[PDB]
């Protein structure tokens, strides 16, 4: 099957260094302390956060120096072509909630809420392509909506490598083809990387170009989400006064 | 810039499971048209293979004229060809890999006037299906609209000639845009290119072999081999005395025709050989002397079932590079060539074909299936290297 | 929880046909039902009765008939309880509520005339259609039973069930062949799908569509399952206090009348949404 | 079980001039109640009341752990281990009967070497072995 | 499979699905009759309170544990329903089942309106019920027995709980029946079980689902269920009397 | 009775219904705020390398050396001498625990409480047994913050006559940023009811105490003419709080009068709020202006 | 070229190293010089 | 119970060291703690010791039916495990957020690299195929569990030897080491993990850290890369915030280290095969150091089995025979019978009525 034509067009019609269309939203729910909604291409995510509160259970599991970040991951049973129902014991959810907890224990400026918990929930309504970056961006928007201070605006994007060229924002068809996939979590102002992942084989000479293309695609996600945040804050500033 | 749309699909897996997979599609403003009269260079900049305007016309098959008549469109006298990507996609998803590789070599060549057009990635030539349809009608509609768009982008200067083998496209489409015709192929040739009479005999050849084509393809239905049956039948058919049974061998100069049944019964044909290999014990009826053949009329037979079932474990080879890079790069199915002329080719599924093209390997056989012309197998173990005595 | 004085004020108000919102002893807050929200599924709904939020999905798949009857299909429910609804719903903890709702839905739909079962069988003893109803709790704001029993009738009305004409003959292609048409489907005749009616009891008066505060002041409640025609399917009493025989008879009439109005108005609203088709766009979660 | 100090157990400590003791610091002190009926309790100055080196110790050294045998062997009146080991590298030690030792050499390299080579002195019997061993490590 | 039990065959199809004897015909009866019932209280010796209820083909054993450590200002009432695997037509998975959890909740939401938990602060009561044989209405036996056990365990209650059961005939003129059996329950269309307090005259629990859709049959099903719970009371009246007469005289 | 079931309507963005341009300075996390020679960081910002970097979305507010960012959604932060309303969630041996929409729990010490008797008789350990009896779980109080602890905790006291356990009424919880700072948070609105504007976002509405601490129960029925006033104020408060409105005495009084023409039951529609909030907006415009 | 540049940089330490000696010390402390 | 806490003097000393570029145990920055492998007697069993860590690897195969789809391959389980004896903290169900990241690292490396040849492990299709099952256990925790676990899994998989079968026509047969010789496996490449630790916000790094150095570090970087020059997984984790030159430097370092480790592994497997083929003695027993105080060996011993008959005989003869009061069973009514002291009446009746 052709994943890159001779003309340079992909299966869905975009070039190598081209992203899908994103359409976000802030303030979806009312009861919670924060909310967000993003649809990156054909993947629909959702995130809900709860502000610093009293530790549930009160089983002396607190930290006297910082706060306790608690991230979960879930997925709807109609999120793909087949039903594929799973119980709440899978290790895919555990590893996704652990990479989420790892990146948000580094992005959030947590040394201001001693002996407090932060509960972050992510719900995926339709998965087609990169799920990690869609969850990270939806929870970055939900955290901004909740007013929790943070060092920067963390954004994530993936990449690939086919026929000696570097792709960007891979889809499920391209992902399920046995290629060197790769994902980041970038802080645009400093250029630092919060998380790095990889699978499948790849030569050592092509790591610089796949990593550079992924970082550039994350910097391209940054501008599009930045205009959404600026329009939202100008909206509320106009409403307030 | 781009404009998202969707495409549903109905994929049928090998186990009988269909699914409504949904997928993406991204339109663009400016699809390059690879022409020397595009009235704005920069917007695409035409960075590829580019025609030179000397021709009288331009002919675009709709989908079929390149599906089967392709063997015509190689003659270096033909000039001014443009392929609609929807036809290329049709042939790829309908004609396997050989025709597609020939077409793509044709395209990827600086000898002819062949280019390719992104009909489906251009923002006003794409059209969605409607209530009551078929791939053929949607196909011709899309090709037509693509033609019209290419014409109007050309500023009505170079006369496009849409060739079809559809008659109803002739009867309706070809009468409502001045400067573009929907004519049959032989009319195209006659009307334009007389001194190409060579193409005329080959086109008449393939059209008479076409009237055949439907007759041979509809006198074949949906069965390839006589289906087998139980053993107690063969017990009886032996005892009652209407079934002999012996060993079976094959010639090796002629190994698709000359199969013998050592009591010698001449088996002629694959459809007569009925999915069976040498060294086997098969039960066979006789046949009437009015349908016997020559090497006098000899007692040819008919095999319905195999009592006792003798296999072996062969030594085969892998195809060649320039025909693997086209298999994809994750090519599940593959074809293997045995080492003695007496054995058919075997269908197996592996994922290392691009790094074992200098080694002998070993395979086996699990099941001969009739919806395939070949028997199935599975890799077994590696062997030595082609070139060294070992 | 709420203090004793607040509970006294609320119970006194209900007896005077006044409530903190301002409605009466029988008023019903509006809802924002919608359909065709999810892509990958074969039918969707989204019911918003207030602070609550529901989202369901129905997918029809190939399957095998059960042993007791060969000319039938079956229905599969799975009431998920997402952890975004409440922090106390983290991981384990939403299992008992989800099982309670799934069992209630099974009791509701466990009847021969629920929708149909002949239509979902194609070849006896060999094949059948299966339906997966997947409820997803997004928020909890009281009256959770009815906000789901409405989104189920709504989503069931929007099914597709793509038609298959494959011949079962052995000589022919027994393997399931579809119609190859991406837009060829069939409706489901959901006219008489039942719905749940809740009746909280405060003082000696019964109240429909009680809020969380009005639910915390109640001791018992009754559930009635009524179709559009006005017939009862399931009847379960839930609570922590006695109810008395009389209140059963005087709650049954209110269940009948509210059910009839709910069904007629739901038929009208779905027909209004359907009268104009691909126009009007679709808006949800954005 | 963990032990238990008191804020006034230190030298010259009252309700106002409490001592600065953080979480995660090492203290030199002796026990006064160690029966198997309660959590052990230790005071930290003296019998009379003048803290003789007790209290919080350790600012630029390394704390490692050894078995009870080496501690028993070193705390002997006929033990020449410390004198010969200190001949090579000048040192100062504060032993602990729970199996812990605090060392402070001049160079960090020397503190690493003393830390590694002291855990092995319970074994590797003296004479035929210890002098040659000392010469090899002299370097 | 399970690492805390003895593993046997992975799959096992019972011979009922291969049983070549066709389903028989139940028969007919008078719908104004009750199966004779024998009740015994104070059975177990190591339990604070116990009772054994048997009527026709039903055998259920219930035991009550005393208050233990751990809406406070009030005590909890834990419940646990479990039936023996060698009960019914087929075997059942030991780990559990959704039906058992449904009957456990139908027990908890029916025995709390009787006991007064405002006398056991920070304490809790645990009730365990076991069904040795399923030969008819089961939830009409897990309520009577678990209520007899509580009264015999010396806990303070407002009143007892007496249960009943009904089923609907499948004929063209359906009629509700009292105390159905498995031959009259697997051929039925709907069933109803009521929990009536005989003295306070207050319904404690209600449960019913099926094919009966006219709101004039359920009025009769409810009120004949109440007449059944008013007719089962005297036997339970003499059972606790005999239980206390024997328990007291042993001192 | 008709059980209206409407359909969702697309939201109109940009707040084009009136039209205004902001003259403020707006930032988002990661933006570099003014980086002059010497400045002091406020709440909402942090420092990197010779840079004042905003850490939360909002608008910068400076008073003469101080760069800080004011977010538009936060939780309550305690300050000395601030009127709060809370609920008891834990009763301990020597304290209660009160939830007031803060990052932690708030502690009400037994030493600061107007115990029953309301005078100087005695205070000893005999009261400790019955202290956990009257201020039980889930009660409502209204106290004043005393001091700030070392980990953001707040201690609140009830050493007055207007503070103590509350009685009947309704409670409305909103975000703690729509309440305008004033000097009198206790009000006696001339409508038939009263109100307490808790600085933490808790709004308590109760009837006027007829003539003239939880000592009085007064668990007797409340007249019909009082409930309709409480329901009207409840709905009007919801209406103003929803779109933008900051809550205080004049806005609620203005909206209450504007709500007389039509019924209390029918005001739940998206448009009736708009036609009431705009009328209150113009009444404030024609009064202040 | 580059393979030998980083060769001389990131080798295992050559020969007589401290780690060698301290492991010698460990296995000479647990030895047995009487059999 | 929990693990001893970390003081505030060791942290200062370790960081002063790291600043000064000198480590506790003497080894410089780009070094490993030397390795020592030992082979069992039956194939696919080894004990690797990196520094003072121990891992036990054991491979084992079995013949099953190959699911549905993928009818011409075999499956490959894995199961890491942490033994309660490895360290105080490890508790059977209280360390569930290290097991996951470890199993994942191991599985992504070993199963996505495609080094094992699961193509040629079929006998028929749709019918019985071999199901291998790797198993690792941690015995002693001293830091860098994953390098040791990876080397252990590699050696255990490169030392296994399957059973072997005859297939011709449509008929099966299963041999045994005396009927037919066990057969090796096919291993494409050798994916070997490497770990890096970062200290005080990426300013310094240290290769192959042990357990104290693991508690004074910010975050960890792992780079799994088979022989030649081909990377197979990377997973940044911990608390780190990285640059772009550093990933490349790390990749170089991992290249070098995997080269050296594969050298060592190949040499050790070769030596082991030579020993097994010469005809000498092998196994866990003939590996115990004899030059050491804590080892002792004892050859066989007949003890004296000359007396047991007499003692048993006299014991049987010298004790009291079974007595002869025989009890009677009582019959009440078919179905129930009682034995013992019995009950006075036949059965109770109208006792209280």
Tab-separated table of N, CA, C and O in Angstrom, chain E residues 242 245-246, chain H residues 351-353:
chain	number	residue	atom	x	y	z
E	242	UNK	N	-41.696	-19.857	70.103
E	242	UNK	CA	-41.057	-21.115	70.476
E	242	UNK	C	-39.553	-20.926	70.633
E	242	UNK	O	-38.933	-21.514	71.529
E	245	UNK	N	-39.035	-19.273	73.994
E	245	UNK	CA	-39.390	-20.182	75.076
E	245	UNK	C	-38.292	-21.213	75.297
E	245	UNK	O	-37.958	-21.542	76.442
E	246	UNK	N	-37.716	-21.735	74.210
E	246	UNK	CA	-36.646	-22.717	74.350
E	246	UNK	C	-35.333	-22.067	74.776
E	246	UNK	O	-34.607	-22.619	75.612
H	351	UNK	N	-42.864	-31.301	70.617
H	351	UNK	CA	-42.087	-31.017	71.820
H	351	UNK	C	-42.596	-29.762	72.513
H	351	UNK	O	-42.688	-29.711	73.745
H	352	UNK	N	-42.926	-28.736	71.730
H	352	UNK	CA	-43.386	-27.458	72.245
H	352	UNK	C	-44.838	-27.152	71.904
H	352	UNK	O	-45.418	-26.242	72.509
H	353	UNK	N	-45.435	-27.874	70.959
H	353	UNK	CA	-46.837	-27.677	70.610
H	353	UNK	C	-47.737	-28.591	71.433
H	353	UNK	O	-48.680	-29.186	70.911
